[PDB]
């Protein structure tokens, strides 16, 4: 069901071309006939507004859209009742006969599990967990344990829920802990880092994404190129230049992801320019990475400007470490930027205490600030005193 949410995500914000929404509309129109998208199909106009969100023929009647295929018709209304009768009502009476005849135990549990997948096809999350709840008590091995997590995993991608999903995945792993292969383990790991992208946990999201293999494909839950983008792109913003050399630019897997799919242009164009110390052409690579990768992806729209700006802070940080100073004509001119725009980039970086440097006007000399003999025994050491002073007397002042 993620294939529908991935394509229909372009219907939210498109600043380049409308054809991106028209091409993605073919996947929405094709998959809605096989499986009912009605909960997400109505959620399109109920999620974001003032783009495509003002076009609905059911709840609120108005038309503002760049895509006219999101409106209800008489065909989807008739097929809504047909899918409920054929995929549920027809198969619910057959399982009801098995409960009355008392045939097997685990076989009856798998019947509600198989039937529960039809509720995801018609888009009913309430009865999907109800069918799995009856088979949860009969679940023993990982066959029926993972299938319950599959429906919970659909809540995150299909219904766009970052809260109730990750809470249930930690409970299933604590019940029966085996892990199977890497793909069954990535469902407890790779997806955990995906939910952390919404709350903006920085490295906590990319901890399990780097160690995750590039062969993970869940189809309905996630595709091959979906995990390929989330693992390769996020790992670049997290791992520093020390880890970029032995992991990102050199990998047995990541190098095969961008080679097969040329639409990434992230781990190649960005890392080579940082390795070759050429920042003249490094700037326009961020536009192709932001517009054609970060924007169209779903979970990569949470941060938005937090992506490039962090790289704009770290792109000069690498140059400051290799020289005790810097020239103005080699920075505000030769790199393609200007004097006023470079002053605005580095103007807000220093007061945030992320880095330290010196900028001059008359001489135009950019000097690098170094800790020298300060390091961690200057601030962190003094800060460590008050850091452990409050937490030590917190429980001691209350006695019992």
């Amino acid at each position: 069901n993620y294939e529908v949410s991935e394509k229909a995500f372009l219907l939210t914000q498109s600043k380049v071309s409308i054809e991106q929404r028209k091409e993605a509309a073919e996947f929405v129109l094709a998959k809605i006939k096989e499986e009912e998208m009605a909960p997400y199909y109505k959620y399109l106009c109920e999620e974001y507004l003032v783009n495509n969100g003002q076009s609905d023929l059911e709840h609120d009647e108005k038309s503002d859209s760049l895509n006219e295929w999101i409106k209800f018709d008489q065909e989807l209304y008739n097929e809504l009742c047909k899918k409920n009768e054929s995929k549920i009502k027809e198969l619910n009476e057959k399982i009801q006969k098995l409960e009355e005849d008392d045939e097997g135990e685990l076989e009856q549990a798998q019947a509600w599990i198989n039937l529960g997948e039809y509720y995801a096809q018609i888009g009913d999350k309430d009865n999907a967990e109800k069918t799995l709840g009856k088979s949860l008590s009969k679940a023993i091995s990982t066959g029926a344990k993972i299938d319950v997590m599959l429906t919970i995993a659909r809540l995150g991608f299909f219904y766009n829920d970052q809260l109730y999903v990750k809470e249930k995945l930690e409970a299933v792993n604590s019940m029966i802990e085996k892990g199977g292969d890497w793909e069954r383990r990535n469902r407890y790991k790779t997806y955990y880092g995906i939910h952390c992208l919404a709350v903006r946990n920085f490295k906590e999201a990319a901890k399990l994404l780097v160690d995750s293999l590039a062969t993970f494909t869940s189809i309905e839950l996630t595709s091959y190129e979906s995990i390929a983008t989330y693992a390769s792109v996020t790992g670049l913003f997290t791992l520093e230049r020390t880890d970029l050399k032995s992991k990102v630019i050199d990998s047995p897997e990541l190098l095969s992801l961008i080679s097969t799919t040329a639409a990434l242009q992230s781990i190649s164009s960005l890392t080579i320019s940082l390795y070759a110390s050429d920042y003249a052409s490094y700037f326009p690579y961020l536009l192709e990475t932001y517009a054609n990768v970060l924007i169209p992806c779903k979970y990569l729209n949470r941060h938005a400007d937090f992506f490039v700006r962090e790289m704009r802070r770290k792109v000069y940080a690498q140059l400051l470490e290799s020289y005790k100073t810097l020239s103005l004509k080699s920075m505000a001119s030769a790199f393609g930027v200007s004097v006023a725009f470079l002053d605005n980039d580095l103007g807000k970086f220093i007061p945030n205490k992320q880095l330290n440097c010196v900028i001059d006007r008359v001489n135009g000399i950019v000097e690098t600030n170094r800790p020298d003999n300060k390091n961690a025994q200057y601030h962190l050491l003094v800060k460590q005193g008050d850091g452990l002073l409050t937490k030590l007397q917190k429980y001691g002042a209350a006695v019992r």
């Binding site: 003249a280 326009p284 400007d305 704009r312 393609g336 930027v337 200007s338 605005n344 007061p351 945030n352």
Partner: peptide, 27 residues
Amino acid sequence: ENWDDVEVDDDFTNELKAELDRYKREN
């Protein structure tokens, strides 16, 4: 946690960097 999350910037989006591609050929 200071000058980070909600304040943001409200610049450095499109129009500022889009002009920088023209400056490379003007030198």
